[PDB]
Structure formats: C-alpha cells, structure tokens
Amino acid sequence: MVEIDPFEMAVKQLERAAQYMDISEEALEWLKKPMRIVEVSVPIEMDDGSVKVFTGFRVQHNWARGPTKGGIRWHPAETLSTVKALATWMTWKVAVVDLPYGGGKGGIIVNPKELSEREQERLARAYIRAVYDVIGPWTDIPAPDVYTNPKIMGWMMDEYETIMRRKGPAFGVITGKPLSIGGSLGRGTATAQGAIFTIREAAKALGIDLKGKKIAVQGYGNAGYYTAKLAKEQLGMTVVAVSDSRGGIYNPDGLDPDEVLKWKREHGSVKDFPGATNITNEELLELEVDVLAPAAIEEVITEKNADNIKAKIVAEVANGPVTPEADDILREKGILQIPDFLCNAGGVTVSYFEWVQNINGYYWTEEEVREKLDKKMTKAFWEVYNTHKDKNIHMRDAAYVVAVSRVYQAMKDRGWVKK
C-alpha cells in the first residue's frame, strides 16, 4: 500500500493549483495526459562485433504555446513514469518566464559509465535516427541533462545534419552545444545569474539596502561558487559562510569566493580554511544572515529547523530544496522564499537564447546576453510576487497560478478547449 509514482505526484500538484484559479473541468483533464509518447528500441553495435538493443523514450507534453523543449536523461533507473513527471514539470517552467515553449523529456535506459567513447557515439547517433520523425528545429528541441554533456549534444546535431540533407536550420535542433559549432556564450554563468537578479529585486520589494548584507550558501558546486562570486562584485553583499559536503566555514568580516577555489582544488574540501570556523550544515541553515540560497540536494530546509531560520530572502536555487511543511512556518515569520522553477529558470532562458541565435544566424556577445536576461527574470518575478499580493497565497502556489494561466489561455485561443 506504499507506492509513490512520480507521474501521479505531478498530477496531484496540478490539482492543487486548480483551486487557486478559475479553470474549467474540460481543460483540467486535458493537461493530465501528454499528447504524444514515443517509446523506441535503439540498437547499437558493441565493441566485439555484437548487437544490443536499448529502450529509448520521447515524451512531448503540450505544444500549445510553441515548440516543446526538454532535456535528455541517460540513467539505468529510468522509467516512463519518471520521464512523464519531468515532462509535465517542464511545461510550468518554460511558461513562468514567458518563453514560447512547451514541455518535454527523453530518456534511454542505459548506464553510461560502462560504455566506451566510441560506443557513446553509436548510441547518441542511433537515438536520433529512431525519433527523427517527432523532433526538429520548430517541433521538439533536446537539451543536456543528467549523464549528458556538451560533447554528446554535438554528435546528435551531426546525425541530424546527415538525415535532413542540410535543408533547414540544423544548429537549432538542439541547445547546449560547444562554442565552435554554434553554441552561445553565458552558459557557464547561466543558472547563477538568474538568482542574482531576483535577489536584487526581492530586496527592492522589501526595501532593503543591500550594500553590506550577509549571505550563507549551502553547497559549493558550479552554482554555489558563481552565486557567491557575483554576490560580492555585482551586488556587494558580505560573503560570510560557504559550505560543501564536508562542512562549513565562518568569517563575520568577509570571504574570498575566488581564493576558496584555489584551496578546494588544492586540498580536498574547504575544510580548515585559514581564518575560518569548521561548523556543520545544520548550524549554517539557522544562522542570522540576510539571505539564504541552497545550492545542494533537495529537502535541506525542513520542518525540523523551520522555526529557527533567521533570514529575509530565501532563494531555492536547487530543484525543490524546501519541504511543503516548511512553507507555512516560513510564511508567517516574515520571510520571502522564491519558487524552485522561478529561481533557477536561467538555465532555460539562456538555453532559449541559443535557439534564437541559431534560427537567425547572428551570434550575440557577452554583453547582449546579460542585458536581455536581465529583463526576463525581472518581469517574471513581478508577475509572481504581485500575484501573491492580490489573492494572498504562498509564493510556491502563486507561481503555479501564473504558469497555468498562460498555457490555458493559449489552449483556449487555439480552439482546443471551448469552455
């Protein structure tokens, strides 16, 4: 009697957002089933001259607003209920920042640490020849995800340029490519620049002077380093405590976010930094700082430490790092938490800015991409926050109101749902 299917969990979080908006009964049952599911058998030839058959998928949820966009997962524990759950989730993520996109996902049941470099070419090309009839530059756009990389996405583009016979924009069939084949700049600081702009406007919303505030960051990945690096130079906040999988440090007078990387590659972790205090992630979450931003695994700020939070703006940079029971405890104390698909939506805004470049054929520089991302994540926050001021719901539920209202209004104008 204990079964948690991922696709049923994505449906239950849609029926929650059906009550905060006036939506008909005929559009509620339209959004609960994806509109085209393809499951193919993908054969490769191995290294010893023998044949295997891996099982691939491709799920396209809802193309009402435009061409669908979604990553590619390579994982041995992939199921169709886990691909469809991220396929529904991709529709409310590309719509909340107002892109002309729909949701999608694709997966292959394989373990990529047991294939050679040549066999990863014969799999990445044979996946394209199986689902070429349901993708394209204006139909369905792949992207990189877990156990894929920019090295592989160049190969899927090459097999598309062989099948299409070069009669159309082939560089726009896939985003997240290398720079010298038709990629875009600003993809290394893509996700972390999204959280900087919304923090800059959330402190504007409270009326806070940001010149000298304090920030604690859980996790020190590529997102955790780039958030703390740009917090000193762009905004000006005093970096006081960063952490990783080992533990956390502490300095109430400032930190170098760049020389820490000089230590972390040299040593094993940021443990025993000179002029620091080795504390845990548990004390780091309940510190007294101005703004918290987790760049770590899910469910870090839970109901067992929700009352002890001393902060003002919470930026959920990860994919759902806050439990639903910790929402109502945080909401009454006077804290403002950013949704999971609103803070890190920069990885979809920058990946959309590549597809505009490849369709036109004119590549922008680092100044033009930073400027046009600055207007997108500013407007998408003041549609979400002002919706929270009108009906007085939590910021997690308030972003679900704006995300479905755009897709339902595009479904009603295309004539699909009359009422």
PDB file of C-alpha atoms in Angstrom, residues 109-308:
ATOM      1  CA  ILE A 109      17.708   3.068 -20.134  1.00  0.00           C
ATOM      2  CA  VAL A 110      21.497   2.623 -20.016  1.00  0.00           C
ATOM      3  CA  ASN A 111      24.441   3.056 -17.655  1.00  0.00           C
ATOM      4  CA  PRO A 112      26.921   5.392 -19.388  1.00  0.00           C
ATOM      5  CA  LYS A 113      29.921   4.507 -17.197  1.00  0.00           C
ATOM      6  CA  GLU A 114      30.208   1.085 -18.831  1.00  0.00           C
ATOM      7  CA  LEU A 115      30.366   2.205 -22.473  1.00  0.00           C
ATOM      8  CA  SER A 116      33.499   3.313 -24.309  1.00  0.00           C
ATOM      9  CA  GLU A 117      33.913   6.651 -26.059  1.00  0.00           C
ATOM     10  CA  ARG A 118      33.190   5.113 -29.459  1.00  0.00           C
ATOM     11  CA  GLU A 119      30.103   3.327 -28.137  1.00  0.00           C
ATOM     12  CA  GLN A 120      28.759   6.619 -26.803  1.00  0.00           C
ATOM     13  CA  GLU A 121      28.911   7.885 -30.372  1.00  0.00           C
ATOM     14  CA  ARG A 122      26.968   4.902 -31.721  1.00  0.00           C
ATOM     15  CA  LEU A 123      24.269   5.390 -29.085  1.00  0.00           C
ATOM     16  CA  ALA A 124      23.921   9.164 -29.401  1.00  0.00           C
ATOM     17  CA  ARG A 125      23.568   8.888 -33.169  1.00  0.00           C
ATOM     18  CA  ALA A 126      21.221   5.900 -33.150  1.00  0.00           C
ATOM     19  CA  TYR A 127      18.876   7.691 -30.773  1.00  0.00           C
ATOM     20  CA  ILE A 128      18.355  10.417 -33.384  1.00  0.00           C
ATOM     21  CA  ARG A 129      17.596   8.014 -36.246  1.00  0.00           C
ATOM     22  CA  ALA A 130      14.821   6.424 -34.172  1.00  0.00           C
ATOM     23  CA  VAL A 131      12.909   9.588 -33.177  1.00  0.00           C
ATOM     24  CA  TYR A 132      13.754  11.877 -36.107  1.00  0.00           C
ATOM     25  CA  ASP A 133      10.089  11.828 -37.130  1.00  0.00           C
ATOM     26  CA  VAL A 134       8.991  13.587 -33.907  1.00  0.00           C
ATOM     27  CA  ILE A 135      11.772  16.170 -33.410  1.00  0.00           C
ATOM     28  CA  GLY A 136      13.038  19.161 -35.349  1.00  0.00           C
ATOM     29  CA  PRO A 137      14.058  22.814 -35.075  1.00  0.00           C
ATOM     30  CA  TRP A 138      10.451  24.029 -34.782  1.00  0.00           C
ATOM     31  CA  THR A 139       8.913  20.834 -33.355  1.00  0.00           C
ATOM     32  CA  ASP A 140      10.918  19.470 -30.402  1.00  0.00           C
ATOM     33  CA  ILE A 141      14.277  20.694 -29.115  1.00  0.00           C
ATOM     34  CA  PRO A 142      16.527  18.441 -26.981  1.00  0.00           C
ATOM     35  CA  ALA A 143      18.891  19.704 -24.265  1.00  0.00           C
ATOM     36  CA  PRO A 144      21.554  18.310 -21.886  1.00  0.00           C
ATOM     37  CA  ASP A 145      20.685  16.714 -18.558  1.00  0.00           C
ATOM     38  CA  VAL A 146      21.970  14.064 -16.116  1.00  0.00           C
ATOM     39  CA  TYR A 147      24.819  11.961 -17.616  1.00  0.00           C
ATOM     40  CA  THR A 148      24.873  14.009 -20.790  1.00  0.00           C
ATOM     41  CA  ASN A 149      27.373  16.718 -21.646  1.00  0.00           C
ATOM     42  CA  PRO A 150      28.126  19.242 -24.425  1.00  0.00           C
ATOM     43  CA  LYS A 151      30.368  16.634 -26.071  1.00  0.00           C
ATOM     44  CA  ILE A 152      27.406  14.355 -26.806  1.00  0.00           C
ATOM     45  CA  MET A 153      24.983  17.051 -27.995  1.00  0.00           C
ATOM     46  CA  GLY A 154      27.359  17.892 -30.828  1.00  0.00           C
ATOM     47  CA  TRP A 155      27.027  14.338 -32.127  1.00  0.00           C
ATOM     48  CA  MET A 156      23.217  14.351 -32.161  1.00  0.00           C
ATOM     49  CA  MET A 157      23.386  17.537 -34.219  1.00  0.00           C
ATOM     50  CA  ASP A 158      25.710  15.875 -36.732  1.00  0.00           C
ATOM     51  CA  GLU A 159      23.371  12.933 -37.295  1.00  0.00           C
ATOM     52  CA  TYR A 160      20.550  15.415 -37.828  1.00  0.00           C
ATOM     53  CA  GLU A 161      22.613  17.269 -40.427  1.00  0.00           C
ATOM     54  CA  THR A 162      23.079  13.990 -42.308  1.00  0.00           C
ATOM     55  CA  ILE A 163      19.420  12.931 -42.289  1.00  0.00           C
ATOM     56  CA  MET A 164      17.923  16.343 -43.114  1.00  0.00           C
ATOM     57  CA  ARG A 165      20.314  16.832 -46.091  1.00  0.00           C
ATOM     58  CA  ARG A 166      21.032  20.378 -44.807  1.00  0.00           C
ATOM     59  CA  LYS A 167      17.681  21.799 -45.972  1.00  0.00           C
ATOM     60  CA  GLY A 168      16.953  23.874 -42.877  1.00  0.00           C
ATOM     61  CA  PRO A 169      18.481  25.389 -39.739  1.00  0.00           C
ATOM     62  CA  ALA A 170      20.219  22.378 -38.227  1.00  0.00           C
ATOM     63  CA  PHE A 171      22.054  24.255 -35.455  1.00  0.00           C
ATOM     64  CA  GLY A 172      18.720  24.993 -33.796  1.00  0.00           C
ATOM     65  CA  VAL A 173      17.683  21.370 -33.458  1.00  0.00           C
ATOM     66  CA  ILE A 174      19.469  21.104 -30.103  1.00  0.00           C
ATOM     67  CA  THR A 175      20.725  23.540 -27.485  1.00  0.00           C
ATOM     68  CA  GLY A 176      23.740  23.298 -25.254  1.00  0.00           C
ATOM     69  CA  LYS A 177      26.348  22.658 -27.945  1.00  0.00           C
ATOM     70  CA  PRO A 178      30.061  23.597 -27.877  1.00  0.00           C
ATOM     71  CA  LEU A 179      31.026  27.170 -28.769  1.00  0.00           C
ATOM     72  CA  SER A 180      32.667  26.471 -32.145  1.00  0.00           C
ATOM     73  CA  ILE A 181      29.789  24.542 -33.723  1.00  0.00           C
ATOM     74  CA  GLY A 182      27.082  27.073 -32.940  1.00  0.00           C
ATOM     75  CA  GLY A 183      26.781  27.444 -29.201  1.00  0.00           C
ATOM     76  CA  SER A 184      26.081  30.595 -27.219  1.00  0.00           C
ATOM     77  CA  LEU A 185      28.035  32.441 -24.548  1.00  0.00           C
ATOM     78  CA  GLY A 186      26.889  32.974 -20.986  1.00  0.00           C
ATOM     79  CA  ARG A 187      26.145  29.284 -20.454  1.00  0.00           C
ATOM     80  CA  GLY A 188      28.675  28.824 -17.664  1.00  0.00           C
ATOM     81  CA  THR A 189      27.190  31.584 -15.535  1.00  0.00           C
ATOM     82  CA  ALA A 190      23.689  30.777 -16.768  1.00  0.00           C
ATOM     83  CA  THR A 191      21.829  29.440 -13.726  1.00  0.00           C
ATOM     84  CA  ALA A 192      23.626  31.514 -11.091  1.00  0.00           C
ATOM     85  CA  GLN A 193      22.978  34.814 -12.863  1.00  0.00           C
ATOM     86  CA  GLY A 194      19.265  34.075 -12.621  1.00  0.00           C
ATOM     87  CA  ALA A 195      19.311  34.044  -8.830  1.00  0.00           C
ATOM     88  CA  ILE A 196      21.272  37.306  -8.653  1.00  0.00           C
ATOM     89  CA  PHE A 197      18.632  39.355 -10.469  1.00  0.00           C
ATOM     90  CA  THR A 198      15.664  38.059  -8.469  1.00  0.00           C
ATOM     91  CA  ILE A 199      17.550  38.661  -5.205  1.00  0.00           C
ATOM     92  CA  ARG A 200      18.296  42.191  -6.444  1.00  0.00           C
ATOM     93  CA  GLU A 201      14.578  42.803  -6.944  1.00  0.00           C
ATOM     94  CA  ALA A 202      13.364  40.980  -3.828  1.00  0.00           C
ATOM     95  CA  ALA A 203      15.458  43.279  -1.643  1.00  0.00           C
ATOM     96  CA  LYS A 204      13.886  46.106  -3.639  1.00  0.00           C
ATOM     97  CA  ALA A 205      10.461  44.678  -2.757  1.00  0.00           C
ATOM     98  CA  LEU A 206      11.229  44.640   0.961  1.00  0.00           C
ATOM     99  CA  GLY A 207      13.018  47.981   0.820  1.00  0.00           C
ATOM    100  CA  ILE A 208      16.419  46.732   1.983  1.00  0.00           C
ATOM    101  CA  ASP A 209      19.795  48.396   1.434  1.00  0.00           C
ATOM    102  CA  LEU A 210      21.951  45.604   0.017  1.00  0.00           C
ATOM    103  CA  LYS A 211      25.287  47.384   0.486  1.00  0.00           C
ATOM    104  CA  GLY A 212      26.839  45.188   3.169  1.00  0.00           C
ATOM    105  CA  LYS A 213      24.412  42.371   3.977  1.00  0.00           C
ATOM    106  CA  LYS A 214      25.393  38.755   4.720  1.00  0.00           C
ATOM    107  CA  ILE A 215      24.754  35.568   2.742  1.00  0.00           C
ATOM    108  CA  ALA A 216      25.178  31.880   3.623  1.00  0.00           C
ATOM    109  CA  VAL A 217      25.257  29.319   0.803  1.00  0.00           C
ATOM    110  CA  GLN A 218      24.789  25.575   1.310  1.00  0.00           C
ATOM    111  CA  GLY A 219      26.737  23.657  -1.311  1.00  0.00           C
ATOM    112  CA  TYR A 220      29.688  24.873  -3.334  1.00  0.00           C
ATOM    113  CA  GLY A 221      29.241  23.479  -6.822  1.00  0.00           C
ATOM    114  CA  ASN A 222      29.396  25.441 -10.042  1.00  0.00           C
ATOM    115  CA  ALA A 223      26.168  27.137  -8.959  1.00  0.00           C
ATOM    116  CA  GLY A 224      27.396  27.712  -5.409  1.00  0.00           C
ATOM    117  CA  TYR A 225      30.709  29.254  -6.430  1.00  0.00           C
ATOM    118  CA  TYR A 226      29.201  31.537  -9.064  1.00  0.00           C
ATOM    119  CA  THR A 227      26.432  32.779  -6.771  1.00  0.00           C
ATOM    120  CA  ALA A 228      28.929  33.741  -4.067  1.00  0.00           C
ATOM    121  CA  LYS A 229      31.367  35.241  -6.580  1.00  0.00           C
ATOM    122  CA  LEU A 230      28.807  37.554  -8.170  1.00  0.00           C
ATOM    123  CA  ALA A 231      27.320  38.484  -4.788  1.00  0.00           C
ATOM    124  CA  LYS A 232      30.425  40.464  -3.834  1.00  0.00           C
ATOM    125  CA  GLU A 233      31.049  42.236  -7.131  1.00  0.00           C
ATOM    126  CA  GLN A 234      27.609  42.867  -8.669  1.00  0.00           C
ATOM    127  CA  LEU A 235      25.515  43.341  -5.528  1.00  0.00           C
ATOM    128  CA  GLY A 236      28.079  43.941  -2.782  1.00  0.00           C
ATOM    129  CA  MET A 237      26.962  41.556  -0.015  1.00  0.00           C
ATOM    130  CA  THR A 238      29.483  40.401   2.586  1.00  0.00           C
ATOM    131  CA  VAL A 239      30.096  36.693   1.994  1.00  0.00           C
ATOM    132  CA  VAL A 240      30.182  35.199   5.483  1.00  0.00           C
ATOM    133  CA  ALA A 241      29.826  31.401   5.222  1.00  0.00           C
ATOM    134  CA  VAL A 242      30.020  28.845   2.415  1.00  0.00           C
ATOM    135  CA  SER A 243      29.887  25.082   2.740  1.00  0.00           C
ATOM    136  CA  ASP A 244      30.229  21.783   0.894  1.00  0.00           C
ATOM    137  CA  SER A 245      29.732  18.063   1.560  1.00  0.00           C
ATOM    138  CA  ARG A 246      32.380  18.045   4.307  1.00  0.00           C
ATOM    139  CA  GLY A 247      31.318  21.010   6.425  1.00  0.00           C
ATOM    140  CA  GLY A 248      31.054  24.788   6.599  1.00  0.00           C
ATOM    141  CA  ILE A 249      33.322  27.729   7.343  1.00  0.00           C
ATOM    142  CA  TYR A 250      32.686  31.059   9.044  1.00  0.00           C
ATOM    143  CA  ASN A 251      34.064  34.607   8.958  1.00  0.00           C
ATOM    144  CA  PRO A 252      31.995  37.634  10.051  1.00  0.00           C
ATOM    145  CA  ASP A 253      34.215  40.095   8.135  1.00  0.00           C
ATOM    146  CA  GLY A 254      34.101  38.717   4.593  1.00  0.00           C
ATOM    147  CA  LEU A 255      35.377  35.822   2.463  1.00  0.00           C
ATOM    148  CA  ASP A 256      37.239  35.358  -0.808  1.00  0.00           C
ATOM    149  CA  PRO A 257      34.922  33.397  -3.128  1.00  0.00           C
ATOM    150  CA  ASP A 258      37.791  33.020  -5.610  1.00  0.00           C
ATOM    151  CA  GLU A 259      40.726  32.013  -3.388  1.00  0.00           C
ATOM    152  CA  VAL A 260      38.475  29.366  -1.835  1.00  0.00           C
ATOM    153  CA  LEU A 261      38.556  27.656  -5.243  1.00  0.00           C
ATOM    154  CA  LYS A 262      42.350  27.893  -5.024  1.00  0.00           C
ATOM    155  CA  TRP A 263      42.104  25.910  -1.784  1.00  0.00           C
ATOM    156  CA  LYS A 264      39.365  23.455  -2.796  1.00  0.00           C
ATOM    157  CA  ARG A 265      41.204  22.175  -5.876  1.00  0.00           C
ATOM    158  CA  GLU A 266      44.478  22.075  -3.923  1.00  0.00           C
ATOM    159  CA  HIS A 267      43.048  20.476  -0.760  1.00  0.00           C
ATOM    160  CA  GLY A 268      40.110  18.033  -0.622  1.00  0.00           C
ATOM    161  CA  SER A 269      37.480  20.491   0.576  1.00  0.00           C
ATOM    162  CA  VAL A 270      37.062  23.977   2.036  1.00  0.00           C
ATOM    163  CA  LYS A 271      37.767  22.370   5.433  1.00  0.00           C
ATOM    164  CA  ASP A 272      40.439  24.110   7.562  1.00  0.00           C
ATOM    165  CA  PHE A 273      40.468  27.398   5.655  1.00  0.00           C
ATOM    166  CA  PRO A 274      42.816  29.941   7.314  1.00  0.00           C
ATOM    167  CA  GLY A 275      40.719  32.231   9.471  1.00  0.00           C
ATOM    168  CA  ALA A 276      37.595  30.084   9.482  1.00  0.00           C
ATOM    169  CA  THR A 277      35.394  28.029  11.825  1.00  0.00           C
ATOM    170  CA  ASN A 278      34.603  24.429  10.867  1.00  0.00           C
ATOM    171  CA  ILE A 279      30.874  24.118  11.549  1.00  0.00           C
ATOM    172  CA  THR A 280      28.230  21.886  10.025  1.00  0.00           C
ATOM    173  CA  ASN A 281      25.465  22.498   7.505  1.00  0.00           C
ATOM    174  CA  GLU A 282      22.962  22.276  10.373  1.00  0.00           C
ATOM    175  CA  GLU A 283      24.273  25.401  12.100  1.00  0.00           C
ATOM    176  CA  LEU A 284      24.634  27.074   8.692  1.00  0.00           C
ATOM    177  CA  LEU A 285      20.916  26.876   7.900  1.00  0.00           C
ATOM    178  CA  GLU A 286      19.794  28.518  11.162  1.00  0.00           C
ATOM    179  CA  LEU A 287      22.363  31.338  11.068  1.00  0.00           C
ATOM    180  CA  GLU A 288      21.422  35.023  11.400  1.00  0.00           C
ATOM    181  CA  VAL A 289      22.144  36.412   7.920  1.00  0.00           C
ATOM    182  CA  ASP A 290      20.151  38.456   5.424  1.00  0.00           C
ATOM    183  CA  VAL A 291      19.668  35.986   2.558  1.00  0.00           C
ATOM    184  CA  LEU A 292      19.988  32.189   2.204  1.00  0.00           C
ATOM    185  CA  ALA A 293      20.461  30.297  -1.074  1.00  0.00           C
ATOM    186  CA  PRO A 294      20.870  26.493  -1.071  1.00  0.00           C
ATOM    187  CA  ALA A 295      22.857  25.017  -3.959  1.00  0.00           C
ATOM    188  CA  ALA A 296      22.707  21.496  -2.507  1.00  0.00           C
ATOM    189  CA  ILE A 297      20.416  18.434  -2.548  1.00  0.00           C
ATOM    190  CA  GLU A 298      16.640  18.511  -2.045  1.00  0.00           C
ATOM    191  CA  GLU A 299      14.861  18.955   1.307  1.00  0.00           C
ATOM    192  CA  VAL A 300      17.601  20.801   3.161  1.00  0.00           C
ATOM    193  CA  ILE A 301      15.332  23.324   4.947  1.00  0.00           C
ATOM    194  CA  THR A 302      12.677  21.157   6.590  1.00  0.00           C
ATOM    195  CA  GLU A 303      10.122  21.415   9.383  1.00  0.00           C
ATOM    196  CA  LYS A 304      12.679  20.259  11.988  1.00  0.00           C
ATOM    197  CA  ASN A 305      14.570  23.543  11.625  1.00  0.00           C
ATOM    198  CA  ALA A 306      11.964  25.851  10.057  1.00  0.00           C
ATOM    199  CA  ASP A 307      11.277  27.880  13.204  1.00  0.00           C
ATOM    200  CA  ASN A 308      14.981  28.623  13.740  1.00  0.00           C
TER     201      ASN A 308
END
